[PDB]
Amino acid sequence: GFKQDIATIRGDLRTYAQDIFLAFLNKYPDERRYFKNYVGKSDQELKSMAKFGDHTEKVFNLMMEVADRATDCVPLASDANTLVQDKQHSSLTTGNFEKLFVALVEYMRASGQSFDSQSWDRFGKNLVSALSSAGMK
């Protein structure tokens, strides 16, 4: 279930973080231009970049924290607010986050692993709603 998935993802955090983030940029190429140092690089070129590994680790580390603090796949309003008030995410709309979770849920289904994809779908949707409520457009 959801709680086991957080353990699975944490167990190989860099590998999952990089793969899902890559699935996200490739499915939604417009989102690549938010990350200027990732423009014009192939999957393996990005995986050879130290800063890509580091960034993706930190993102999925935080996502797992929010997921672990969540009750029944609903994240904390203060966790949502953190994402909304952050300098780096100030010029985003909830649409960017929705796309990340589509790519994440798709990835889970296409993998061979027994991920609880429906719980991650709910989690994504509840996070998006919590982002709107905190003032994200």
The residues of the shown chain that bind ligand HEM, judged by CB under 6 A, are 31, 34-35, 55, 58-59, 62-63, 88-89, 92, 96-97, 100
Residue 32: CB minimum distance to ligand HEM, A: 8
Which lies closer to ligand HEM via its Cβ, residue 71 or residue 88? Answer: 88
Find out whether 27 and 33 touch, Cβ atoms under 8 Å: no
Residue 80: CB minimum distance to ligand HEM, A: 9
Q: Which among 122, 132, 3, 17 is positioned nearest to 80, based on CA atoms? A: 132
Residue 54: CB minimum distance to ligand HEM, A: 6
Q: Which among 24, 46, 124, 134 is positioned nearest to 89, based on CA atoms? A: 134
16 labelled ligand-binding? no
Q: Give the Cα separation of 74 and 15 in Å (integer).
A: 26
Residue 91: CB minimum distance to ligand HEM, A: 8
Identify the burial level of 28 via C-beta atoms within 10 angstroms of its C-beta, where 0-12 means exposed, 13-18 middle and 19 or more buried: middle
Residues forming the annotated binding site for heme b?
36, 38, 51, 55, 58, 88-89, 97
Residues forming the annotated binding site?
36, 38, 51, 55, 58, 88-89, 97
